[PDB]
Amino acid sequence: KAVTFYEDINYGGASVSLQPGNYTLSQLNTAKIPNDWMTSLKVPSGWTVDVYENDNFTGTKWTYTSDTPWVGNDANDKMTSVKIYST
Numbered sequence: 867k868a869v870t871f872y873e874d875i876n877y878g879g880a881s882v883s884l885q886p887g888n889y890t891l892s893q894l895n896t897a898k899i900p901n902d903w904m905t906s907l908k909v910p911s912g913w914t915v916d917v918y919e920n921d922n923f924t925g926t927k928w929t930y931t932s933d934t935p936w937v938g939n940d941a942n943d944k945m946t947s948v949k950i951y952s953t
């Protein structure tokens with residue numbers, strides 16, 4: 867299992883899956899995830915996803931613990947860095 871980030875609302879468009887870890891903007895890009903692009907994501911039960919508005923896990927932080935068809939108006943297309951936990 868893994869966290870899957872999607873380009874469009876309700877899990878539409880391009881997608882990219884990631885294992886637990888702390889990913890910076892550069893690392894997201896390498897994994898084929900553009901900046902200000904994430905709109906929805908699926909999260910395994912028991913996992914936690916901290917999406918940060920700025921690089922290096924700073925700026926506003928939005929947390930998700932279950933499938934999310936829409937991250938929210940403020941959080942939409944703002945993920946620049948992200949921490950993923952299997953806890």
Ligand SMILES: [Ca+2]
Nearest residue numbers: 873903904905
């Ligand atoms: Ca988008």
Ligand SMILES: [Ca+2]
Nearest residue numbers: 919920944946
């Ligand atoms: Ca941003």
